[PDB]
Each structure stands twice: as C-alpha cells, then as structure tokens.
Design a protein around this ligand. Sequence first.
Ligand SMILES: *[C@](O)(C(=O)NC1CC1)[C@H](CCCC)NC(=O)[C@@H]1[C@@H]2[C@H](CN1C(=O)[C@@H](NC(=O)NC1(CS(=O)(=O)C(C)(C)C)CCCCC1)C(C)(C)C)C2(C)C
Ligand SMILES: *[C@](O)(C(=O)NC1CC1)[C@H](CCCC)NC(=O)[C@@H]1[C@@H]2[C@H](CN1C(=O)[C@@H](NC(=O)NC1(CS(=O)(=O)C(C)(C)C)CCCCC1)C(C)(C)C)C2(C)C
Lengths: 306, 306
Amino acid sequence: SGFRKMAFPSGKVEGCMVQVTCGTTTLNGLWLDDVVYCPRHVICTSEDMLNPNYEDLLIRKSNHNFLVQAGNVQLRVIGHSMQNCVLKLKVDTANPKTPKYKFVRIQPGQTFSVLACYNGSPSGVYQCAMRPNFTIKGSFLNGSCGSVGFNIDYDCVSFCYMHHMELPTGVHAGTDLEGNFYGPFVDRQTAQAAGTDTTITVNVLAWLYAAVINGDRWFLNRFTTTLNDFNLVAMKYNYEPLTQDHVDILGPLSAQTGIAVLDMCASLKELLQNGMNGRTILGSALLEDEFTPFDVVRQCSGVTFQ
Amino acid sequence: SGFRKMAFPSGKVEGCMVQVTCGTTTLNGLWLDDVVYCPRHVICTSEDMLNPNYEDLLIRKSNHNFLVQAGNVQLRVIGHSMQNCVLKLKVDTANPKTPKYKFVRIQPGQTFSVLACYNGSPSGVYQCAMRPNFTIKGSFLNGSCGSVGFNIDYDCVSFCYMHHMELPTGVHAGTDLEGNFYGPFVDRQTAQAAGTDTTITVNVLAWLYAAVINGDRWFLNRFTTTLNDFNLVAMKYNYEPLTQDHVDILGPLSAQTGIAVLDMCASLKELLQNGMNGRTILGSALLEDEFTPFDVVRQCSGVTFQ
Ligand SMILES: *[C@](O)(C(=O)NC1CC1)[C@H](CCCC)NC(=O)[C@@H]1[C@@H]2[C@H](CN1C(=O)[C@@H](NC(=O)NC1(CS(=O)(=O)C(C)(C)C)CCCCC1)C(C)(C)C)C2(C)C
Ligand SMILES: *[C@](O)(C(=O)NC1CC1)[C@H](CCCC)NC(=O)[C@@H]1[C@@H]2[C@H](CN1C(=O)[C@@H](NC(=O)NC1(CS(=O)(=O)C(C)(C)C)CCCCC1)C(C)(C)C)C2(C)C
C-alpha cells in the first residue's frame, strides 16, 4: 500500500541531455539521433529578450557559434534551423543512446515527469501536471531551460514538454518538442496575460479512489448526486466541469472499490461545501488534483515499463 | 523558483535491477559486480512466514534453485550465502553497468530516493525519508520486495535501503545492503512493536526556509526564543529536541535568507500553538518534515550529479 507522487524512471532520458552554449547563455539540449533540440532564445543576449527578432538574430549567427557538449566528449554543429520556438542543431554524431522516442502534445490535466537539468547534467526528477491554464507548477532555476518532460508508454519515451520561461506568479511555461508553446505565451520578456487556474475534477476523484484503496474512508457519504447538480457545486469553487466521458474513464477505479462515480461525486459534493474540519486524506490536508486516473491504476496495480 | 519533492535520477540504478525467483516466489535483486543481493525470505513458502528457520530453509536449497534474469539474459548462480537478512547470489557474469556504488546506513531524519521495481523492471521513482521510528512512508505492492533506496553523491551511488515488508499502519520497513534491519523488526510474519513517530524538527525548519526563498513569508513573526523554551513547545507536539548541531547546519539557509535559526523557531513556535487557520505554506496546509537542509540547498542552488 501507500501513495506518493511518482515520476517515471529517468534512465532513458539522461543519455539524451547535452550542454548547449551560445555566447554567454548556457542551457540544456535534447540530443536525439543527430539533432539537438533547445529553446531558440539561446541565441539572444541581455537586451535581446526584450523584443527579439529571432529571424534576424539567427541569420547573424553561424554554425561555429553553437557550442554543444555531451559530458567531456563534444559535438560539432553542422546545420542550424528554426522550427517554431525551438532550435534544430544538427550535429555530425548520432546519439548511440537514442531510445524509441515519440513527440506528443498533451492536454490540460495530464501528468508527466520532469528531468530538471543544469549544464546538461541531470539534477532531479519529479512529477507534475499541465494545469488547465497551460502552465506547470515545477521547480526551475537559471540554467534549467531545455529540460524536458516525458512519459514512457512501455519502451517508447513520449517527450511532451521543454522548459522555456517563468511567469511572475512563479509557475512555468514551455513548448512541445515541435516548438509550439502551451498556452497563449510568446518567448519575449514582456508582461502577458495568464488564465485563471481551475481544479482538475476528474483527477481529484481518482485521488479519492486512491484514498479508498489505501484505507481512508471517512470522506465517504451514502447519498448520490446527478451529473448536473454536482456541476453547480463544482463551478462555484472553480472546479472543472465533469462530463460523461470522465465517468467512463474512472471505470476501473469504480469497479475495484465498488463505489460508483456518482457516489464519489456526492462525497466530493459535500467536501467542497463544508471543508474538512481539520482532518487529512492520504496524509494531505488539501484536495490533490495532480493524479490522473491512469496514475492511480499504476500505483495500485504495479504497471512497469522498460 | 518552485519547490517539489524531487527524486534523484535513477539511470544508474535501473541497470542493476534483476529478477530473482525461488520456487513460486519472484522478487527483485540488486546486481553489483558479480553478486546479487535480495531479501532472504525469497526461499520461504506461504507457511514459512509464521516461523521461518532460515538456516534450515537455505540448506534445503541448491544453486540451481535460484534463477536470476536481467531482462532476457539468464545469470547462472554459482554460490549462495546468507548475510543477516539478505541473500547473496554470486553469478557467473559481472554486471558491465556496475556503477560506482557504496553501502551506507542512514540515520533517522535523512532522505533518499526509492526505485520501486516489479519482476526486476523499474516502475518509478519517488523521494521519502527515514522516520524517527525507523519506518518509511513508501508506495509498495506485491512483487516490490528487493526495491532499493539510494542517494547520488556526485558520481557515487550510495545504496542505503532494501524493502522487505509492510506494517499494519501502512508504513514499510527494510534493511540496509548489509542485511541489518532498520529498527527492532525481524523478517517473520508475527505481531511486532513499532515505535511512536515524531516530527523531524530540523527538516520543518529547512522547509520553512525554502518557503521564504520562494515568497511565502506570512508566518514570520517578530518574537524570538532561546534553545530551551522552544523545546518545551516542540516536545509536546512530538518533535525532536532541537540541538545546537541543528543550528549549525542551517547556516547556509540562514545566511541566504538573513533570518536567524532562533528567529524561525519563534515563528514555528506560534505555528504549533495557534494552528494555521486554513492557510498553506509552499502549497501545503501541513508542516513538511521530509526535506533535509541539504535537500533545500539542492533545489535552491542547482546541485547536479553524474
Ligand atoms: C532559461 O533560458 C535559462 O535557464 N537560461 C540560462 C542562462 C540561464 C531562462 C531561465 C528562466 C527562469 C526559471 N529562461 C528565460 O530567460 C526566459 C526567456 C526570456 C526571459 N525569460 C523568463 O523566464 C523571465 N520571465 C518572463 O519573461 N515572463 C513573462 C513576462 S513577466 O514575467 O510578466 C515580467 C514582465 C518580466 C515581469 C514573459 C512570457 C510569459 C510569462 C510572463 C524571467 C527571467 C524574468 C523569469 C525569454 C526569451 C522569454
Ligand atoms: C515481498 O516479499 C514481495 O514483494 N514478494 C513478492 C512475491 C510477492 C513482500 C511484500 C508484501 C507487502 C509490500 N513482503 C512480505 O511478504 C513479508 C515477508 C513476510 C510477510 N511480509 C509482510 O510484509 C506482511 N507484513 C508483516 O508480517 N508485518 C509484521 C506483522 S503484522 O503486520 O503486525 C500482522 C500480525 C501480520 C498483522 C511482521 C514484520 C514487522 C511488521 C509487523 C504482510 C504481507 C501481511 C504485509 C516476511 C517473511 C516478513
């Protein structure tokens, strides 16, 4: 038993991390085959971030301006190209540790593991979720740009995030591995609007099911609620609308615990209105929304990977 | 910025996990050089748990009763020996991916990363701490026995834990890599006394320093205390006696934030007596004691490893 925030094993991603330097800016790059992916704003200076012209800046840059290192052994940049907000630094050596990689663009509510790197060296791994406002609550300092988020299907590493920048609130934003930002953000140092964050309801319900499997059962009621009456209670506390598809996704968890989704909704319908009086659920005093239904099945069935 | 429970990169540990099978029992083993380490109760059946005689049980077993597989490769066992509560299976092939390993026995209050494994395959990594009662709050199912805990010291992997069994309270217990259990426990299915769990005070203080660096400063008061008055409040709510040694390690955190340790103790002093009042520090409504001051320095400075 037990329940903790689990990140995927980072072994297959550590071998793809390199150091990328352009002038005085040093950040991380993703070395897959003979291509090195990194944030395109590595070619900028201090006052270039304020209003950059990336086309004009890349043109004044040449191949010997990019310094790519993989540990002590180096790589020679052969051809630089731009794809949206990421830089394609092609090299003369193909990565022998290239795994079965995969480029995916995730939806708000899905979780992934982040391998935080500095100077091309892995520092730590942790799990987080893409918030409904297309930001992530991660842990990043200077030098962490280029760190990637990923999942493992089985042997297929699914890259889905690359860190770019930090918001004034303290959350973080980035792109997929094709250079397209998550959200309405642009890679420019200027104040931009960020949306209001909501609570992922289908994730809170999966977390409550995890609490039932582990023994926490006090939050449970005997009543039921509609699929519409619950949405009234949800949409006040800035919770996210619950659909019929979410009920079908929670099938496995509903069948193992013998508690219908609409029954667990009635338990959640009561918790949001009254509070918790000062109790705890799974060792937490707040409701957790960073566990997808699939994350709960992994921790309560032992799903392993390559 | 940011702060999340962060685990060490598990790349160097994934290549050491193998599958050990003895009869019907299949669990995980640690492959370092030409030795495989696994819990000794792999030789037990279902009836042996109540009262196992490990000497008499091991004698009835031979080298060909132990089958070890590192994925698709079979490791033929040559010599089996028993050291405390772990079994050694010397195989004919040395692990070519043997990292720079190291066997350590951690103290209560220290943290480490756990690589939960099933059938010799890594399932995920998470961070936890050794509780003062020599238990850990982990996440383990059936087949997870043999999963190891570790720290990464630059280029040296420090193995410090191997999972063995689960307690009635939902917590877990195990041994070091020499076979010596953490705590008074013995590997036998029989009611066994566990100790009262206290809160690691030096970790809560370090966690409060992390909140100050990240922006959370509402809990800072204007009082101050010595080292003895705070211990009266701490020892009632089950915290560890705060010693002068704990004040000395928190230097880097106190020097960066400009807040003395005795100053943070007064702010903590009010936090135990008056509660928090539906408030959250670092996004948590409870006080966290699973972050050593070394962990906080790591996330707030950028320590990487090999
Ligand atoms: C990353 O590139 C890196 O690690 N580089 C190596 C050299 C150290 C670096 C690190 C981010 C902090 C964790 N990322 C950046 O420098 C990017 C790029 C420049 C500025 N930033 C960035 O993160 C800004 N944040 C920022 O610009 N946020 C906004 C504007 S704001 O934050 O509202 C304000 C007007 C500055 C107050 C822009 C985009 C949307 C969010 C708001 C800070 C360095 C100030 C944190 C690029 C080109 C965007
Ligand atoms: C591990 O061997 C494994 O993963 N095997 C693979 C093949 C399935 C397995 C993991 C189980 C839970 C994570 N570990 C065990 O089976 C050990 C060994 C037998 C029994 N257990 C075990 O964990 C017991 N727990 C237990 O016995 N705890 C106590 C006694 S008790 O819990 O108070 C009670 C009287 C049984 C209620 C003894 C040890 C100290 C704590 C108390 C359970 C399977 C019941 C969880 C060994 C040989 C100890």
